[PDB]
């Protein structure tokens, strides 16, 4: 994947929902997994040592040292020991960088531009991770997961474009009845309160094997 590709990407959605096709839903695990194949657990705050368990560059901010476009940069979030992220759009000269960042529903918002100084009333960047830019139901089961991603998205259908109904942070767990295969994502399904039923991908599948997976999955005794 190229950087123009990746930004061009983050762009079109800022420019602008419901039907966002993305079940990882942050900007950087949603970045690295959907354009890269490289899946990161973690809280935001957590992604840079993610990255670097999985052989990516990863860059801490220093005095001379600035990011470059296509960074995925990490923050310390004074408001929240969760941290924050967001896509590297410009090259910084070390004072401002332009940004594209996000904004039941607990994380995973909307795209928007912003521009900030490395340290504000917010936050602070610790660093930015470069990614490698180049140029059905399967089973009825009682079980519960836990969200190993930073956002994961929750729909109504098992369907890549399934209507948004929350999206889930790290740490997230909760009960399932059933698992599902579609639209190249395993899938486990419960009822939410609403009294509706709810599907969440809980990782890529070849077949009907999860061989990524966004949780981990715990089976009743």
Request: glycine share 10%.
């Given at each position: 994947?190229?950087?123009s590709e990746?930004?061009s990407?983050?762009?079109g959605?800022?420019?602008t929902?419901?039907?966002?096709?993305?079940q990882?839903?942050?900007?950087t695990?949603?970045?690295?997994?959907?354009?890269?194949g490289?899946?990161?657990?973690?809280?935001?705050?957590?992604?840079l040592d993610?990255?670097k368990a999985?052989?990516?560059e990863?860059?801490?901010?220093?005095?001379?040292?600035?990011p470059k476009?296509?960074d995925?940069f990490?923050?310390?979030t004074?408001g929240?020991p969760?941290?924050?992220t967001?896509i590297?759009?410009a090259?910084?000269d070390?004072?401002?960088?332009?940004?594209i960042?996000q904004?039941?529903?607990q994380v995973g918002?909307p795209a928007?531009?912003?521009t900030?100084?490395?340290?504000?009333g917010d936050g602070?960047?610790?660093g930015?991770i470069r990614?490698p830019?180049?140029?059905?139901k399967l089973?009825?089961?009682?079980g519960?997961?836990?969200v190993?991603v930073?956002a994961?998205?929750v729909?109504?259908?098992?369907?890549l474009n399934?209507?948004i109904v929350?999206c889930y942070?790290?740490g997230?767990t909760?009960?399932?009845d059933s698992?599902?295969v579609?639209?190249?994502?395993i899938?486990?399904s419960?009822?939410?309160?609403?009294?509706?039923?709810?599907?969440?991908?809980?990782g890529?599948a070849?077949?009907d094997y999860?061989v990524?997976?966004?949780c981990?999955?715990?089976?009743?005794?």
């Open positions: 994947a190229t950087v990746v930004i990407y983050w762009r959605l800022a420019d929902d419901l039907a966002w096709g993305w990882c839903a942050d900007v695990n949603g970045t690295t997994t959907n354009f890269f490289v899946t990161l657990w973690g809280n935001a705050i957590d992604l993610s990255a999985q052989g990516l990863v860059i801490y901010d220093a005095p001379g040292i600035n476009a296509g995925l990490v923050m310390f004074y929240h969760y941290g924050h967001g590297i759009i090259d910084s070390g004072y401002t960088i332009q940004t960042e904004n039941q529903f918002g928007r531009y912003v900030r100084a490395f340290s504000d602070y960047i610790v930015w990614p830019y180049s140029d059905r089973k009825d089961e009682v519960t997961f836990e190993m930073p994961l998205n729909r109504r259908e098992p369907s399934g209507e929350a942070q790290y997230m909760g009960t399932y698992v599902y579609g639209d190249g994502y899938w486990v419960y009822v939410g309160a609403s009294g509706m039923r709810n599907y969440m991908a809980v890529d070849d077949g999860n990524n997976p966004y981990k999955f715990y089976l009743e005794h």
